[PDB]
């Protein structure tokens, strides 16, 4: 599942808060895409919904939402 964060040009950063989420590790972090005013990262192994809910409560406080 692709998860958007309102942070872009204007990867190591998102691997690092996401990798510390309960029940998640680097192996659940897929491709990272960076655009001008937004970025998204593919969350693997069905953990997308979980990562999104946890990130709504986790500071790095970016606005997160499901791409799809």
UniProtKB/Swiss-Prot annotation:
Reported phenotype of the disruption mutant: No visible effect at 37 or 16 degrees Celsius; no change in ribosome profiles. A quadruple disruption of all RNA helicases (cshA, cshB, deaD, yfmL) is not lethal at 37 degrees Celsius, although both 50S and 70S ribosomes are decreased, while growth stops at 16 degrees.
Region (Involved in 23S rRNA binding): 1-68
Subcellular locations according to the entry: Cytoplasm
Induction: In rich medium highest expression in exponential growth, expression decreases in stationary phase (at protein level).
Domains (record comment): Contains an N-terminal domain that binds non-specifically to RNA and a C-terminal domain that binds specifically and tightly to hairpin 92 of 23S rRNA. Undergoes a conformation change in the helicase core upon binding of RNA and ATP.
Function: DEAD-box RNA helicase involved in the assembly of the 50S ribosomal subunit. Has an RNA-dependent ATPase activity, which is specific for 23S rRNA, and a 3' to 5' RNA helicase activity that uses the energy of ATP hydrolysis to destabilize and unwind short rRNA duplexes.
Similarity comment: Belongs to the DEAD box helicase family. DbpA subfamily.
Subunit note: May interact with RNA helicases CshA and CshB.
Protein name (Swiss-Prot/TrEMBL): ATP-dependent RNA helicase DbpA
Organism the protein comes from: Bacillus subtilis (strain 168)
